[PDB]
């Protein structure tokens, strides 16, 4: 989709980028964890 | 060894997007999105070097 063109610059617009982390539509992560923890030491 | 350094001579005015190219020490992006109606002519972006008459 860079080689046709999709300006790769001005797709990410601050909310875009949120749901790129909080999609569970795909391979399984351990960000899970990982912000439990830091949730945790800071609180 | 993709270091041709290759010249494009081309006008001013014939080429697409003069708008675009508007700015002084300035980096400005181009696609190369081409218009098939369109009576300005697309670039050829992997040319190294520009001169615009």
Known sequence: ?????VSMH????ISRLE????????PSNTLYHLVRDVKKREY | ???????????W???E???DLIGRDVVRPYQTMSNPM?????LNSMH???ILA
């Open chain 1, 1 to 5: 989709l860079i080689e046709n063109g």
């Open chain 1, 10 to 13: 001005r797709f990410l617009t």
């Open chain 1, 19 to 26: 749901e790129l982390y909080n999609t569970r539509h795909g």
């Open chain 2, 1 to 11: 060894r993709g270091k041709i350094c290759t010249i494009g001579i081309a006008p």
């Open chain 2, 13 to 15: 005015g014939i080429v």
């Open chain 2, 17 to 19: 997007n003069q708008e």
């Open chain 2, 38 to 42: 369109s009576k300005l002519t697309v």
């Open chain 2, 48 to 50: 190294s070097h520009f």
